[PDB]
Write a protein that binds this DNA or RNA. Structure first.
Lengths: 189, 191, 184, 191, 175, 191
DNA sequence: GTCGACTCAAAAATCAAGTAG
DNA sequence: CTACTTGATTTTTGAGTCGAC
DNA sequence: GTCGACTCAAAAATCAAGTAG
DNA sequence: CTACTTGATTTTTGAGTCGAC
């Protein structure tokens, strides 16, 4: 990972892996299938990665960092948490629609590496707990358990991403977009 | 698919029950039609007399589980003091039901992979029978503004069962139990 | 070669529940082998009997002829031969139980076993008879008499009851073989 | 069996079964094959019989009775056990050719109804033992385990019945009949 | 079937890409067979080339068992080369990999040419020159025209250039 | 290159590369092998050259220019195209007897850089085609296709260059030298 | 017989860290 | 009333096949 | 060579719906 | 400042191996 070319090649393999696993799955994807996509040598996969299941771990970790950083970009504004959660919900549906064909990796994760599947949620919840408890003491949001509410807010985003993002190409209507914002505002008094 | 004689209904159930325990224990792949029919104590071919494909057993396993969860939740909600108290124990007893049906979640994981259409159906039928319950509750003025509200409440139950019932294997504390009802109260009463 | 041997070990199943009640699923499951792998090694369910009875004929004729190979009087050959048969058949209870299944499922093999066994018997019997060792009778008829006695006591005292023959009973049988074959 | 018409029709089904099972085999014969030959309704078989296997149990119980009676007929005259056995053996092989059908079915039994197969030899040996043992006390035949001798004689009859009655329509030549008469004489006559 | 499935994919890939630019991974995937299945049949990657070359030498000997002769036999060689495209391309690769086979092939092609050439010189059919040289002139002409008009281009020669080639053969052989 | 001191080290690499690639082949030749032969630092090779494969491109560029100029010396000052080919052929073979190592690397090119290999024959044909078309109308050489006759002349040169130069080293005898000229003369005589 | 993951000795390409002119 | 009779409907049965890894 | 879903050609059981005695 | 130099260091290569069905 030291050299600029070194970190480039690692990203050639990783971006090749996400396309194949999202199309044919983990089982069907061979190391040859990956390196041939990346246009690199066969043994180069084993230079950057320990084994085949280790690519999924690194795929999930990037499909967490790249999401959380994207959401933190649109939530650097107003000190009020209700405003943070108002944008953080709609922009999550915007990002999931961009990475629509990339949810099939999670299905393949719950099968082959289910431990790193639990990790994505627990790490997302960890940054939704410490960041939520800040606004809690500030009396902006409800004084309850911070960890408990994190899963409630994630669970809503998860289910919406299933129905309006994955199970429908149409998405959300303007009236429903407004309706959603009040639901967030209501359970934060 | 073919329910005429009570013996046919008996044999279909011998198959369906064996499938439920086997898929839960070792998954859809590791379970063979021989495993299903041997445990059921019926002819190998008999599985095909009632089920077109091996995949079609997941369809009827989900249907039976969905209907039995819908009845379990319909039982504890028909008496309650308006919609605000309906979602109060509707969520509460779902987390109790999920610990009773802890072993049989392995099936629902497989569903998302092998038969994702009946996985999609599970939520869409539950949402269709939730929307009717919310449309006439807004008509009374008990709860705030339709279909979107159904999925939101589903996702709360879905994720809490995933974490506090499945992963933690302990449950919810008395403190956290009370905290839940407040989220329900604040989300339905216009504050 | 282990996979074919895993399949063949079939013997346990057919001897206990019988050829009919034994399925390919039963055989392949017990063997811890794929259903289809049975058909890679065997043409049909019936072909397994042929291969089992192939081993059964080999195991027997080799063991049974080891003790009769040197004795003086043919009466002593039969007295011992009978004892060594009932002894072998207790050691190979499974293989015989499968051989019994043949009379319905592969009758041509069953009929052949007895006929080929009669040929080995008649050969030696006709010989000693002409010498004056054995009663002068039809060598083929007497051959089936001793084959019948062996098969019946094998059924009753080995298969139908795991016990066997008592030392007292063994002497009684030895007397029966002697009395019958010794010319007056 | 309450009516005389009932007993009449049962025999129609029974006789066709004997004729068919003997000819084509137990597996090859269907209930339709029996009822059509019998010239009766398909379902009528089930009015008199529990299952296809249950008809074997009745065919063998008649086979045991009819053979035991025929053999009692000729063995009653002689009051010399060696002569009783000499005749009984010939008379058995005679009855065998006369009842090839019934005996051919008895062979199938060892695989389809092994319980009644074992039963026949056991019932036959029990009646044989008490007869031989009494004749041993009279000092007519050798003093050996009577049960053992019962099976020795039974096994001879059975095997000769296979080779010289089933496997070949020929039978025993006068030389072979005389030779067999000697084998039984030499074997039972004490020295 | 598996061993033959390999060779078909193996020949088609080594022809287009070349021995080095073709990996066992490329071969097995084109053949629709497991990676390890290659090593079950062939003990080495060098060994599969030996067999393709051994197969090519069989096809060459079969053709070699058959003034105007050098005119038609020239066009018949290029017609054979177009039908054996993939196999000749693998033979060109031998020059670097196993140079002994490349040298021997041309040397044996010279022997058969020379003996048949020296008989026509005596008869007065063709002009008196070195028989070893004249043969290599005809060999080189074939190898070059086949390299350009058959191997480097899928097109061909055309009846316009076909007649022009016979005019080249005639002029250099008839005085 | 910039300095005459720097350009001095570029030729130290090239004149060491030629000596190794022609001897033990491109594959067996390493950068550590080249740099050590040049008596320089490892990386210095990459300072003057893009990649290992690019050294082949420069060596063949020099090989192409050196031959184009050497043959020009003896053919530039001529009138008859038939005689241009006669001199051109003999001096081509004379050049390779001196430059054996340079042609050996051109053989390695077919396998490692077939792009520059196919370019050489395609550009050598372009020099011939232009020169032939001028002599076609002048009545010097025979009336055929210019591209066809270009490769024909190339093929005779290429083949002889392997057999009498690379494989034997013995070269052509004075009888063979004269016999060859007769072939080229006969070929291009418009009869 | 079939499979596809993982090893390993080579030798490329690339640096940080210097010195010449 | 019970005792037989009917055939079409229904359920049952493994062995053998098939394309896949 | 190894794997397991799936077809298939019969059958055995049923049972409503009757007729005989 | 630029042009050149140095060699350990980091990356790449794809054949051959490895168990396991």
């Amino acid at each position: 990972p030291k050299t600029e070319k070194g970190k480039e090649s690692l990203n050639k393999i990783l971006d090749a892996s996400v396309e194949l696993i999202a199309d044919k799955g983990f089982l069907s994807t061979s190391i040859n299938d990956i390196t041939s996509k990346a246009g690199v040598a066969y043994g180069l996969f084993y230079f950057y990665f320990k084994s085949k299941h280790d690519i999924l771990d690194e795929i999930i970790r990037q499909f967490n960092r790249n999401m959380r950083y994207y959401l933190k970009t649109y939530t650097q504004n107003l000190d009020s948490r209700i405003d943070v959660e108002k944008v953080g919900m709609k922009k999550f549906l915007e990002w999931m629609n961009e990475n629509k064909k990339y949810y099939k990796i999670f299905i393949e994760t719950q099968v082959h590496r289910p431990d790193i599947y639990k990790w994505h949620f627990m790490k997302l919840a960890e940054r939704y707990t410490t960041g939520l408890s800040e606004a809690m003491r500030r009396g902006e949001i409800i004084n309850v358990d911070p960890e408990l509410l994190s899963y409630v807010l994630i669970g809503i985003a998860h289910m919406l991403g299933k129905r309006y993002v994955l199970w429908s190409n149409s998405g959300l209507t303007l009236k429903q977009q407004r309706d959603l914002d009040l639901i967030i505002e209501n359970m934060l008094t």
